[PDB]
Amino acid sequence: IXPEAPGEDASPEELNRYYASLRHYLNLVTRQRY
Ligand code: CNC
């Protein structure tokens, strides 16, 4: 897979965005939970 990737605002705030896309993209395909 490869999700929605940031780089426009601020580093830790955009880490949170990509980590949210990561958990979404996992829930989209495989049965693991957060
Ligand atoms: C391709 O392999 C992708 O990897 C590129 N990338 C991301 N981070 C990198 C760090 C370094 C030193 C180098 C040489 C490359 C790095 C880039 O993201 C490539 O992705 P693409 O899809 O091709 O480009 C997308 C479309 C746009 N990307 C951006 O604009 C960058 C966004 C980012 C918020 C970001 C991301 C998303 C990712 N990092 Co980087 C972090 N954290 N970073 C590492 C790893 C990633 C990770 C792979 C998880 C994300 C990539 C996902 C993606 N496709 O976008 C680690 C390096 C691993 C390695 N291969 O050597 C790390 C060195 C260690 C760590 N885990 O913290 C790392 C650091 C320290 C830093 N990342 C920066 C650049 C952010 C960036 C935000 C920004 N402001 O631009 N990463 C950041 C500034 C964040 C920070 N912690 O401060 C760090 C650089 C050091 C510094 N100057 O402070």
Swiss-Prot record:
The modification Phosphoserine is found at residue 11. It comes from the Eukaryota. This is Peptide YY(3-36). The gene is PYY. The chain holds residues 31 to 63 of 97 of the full protein.
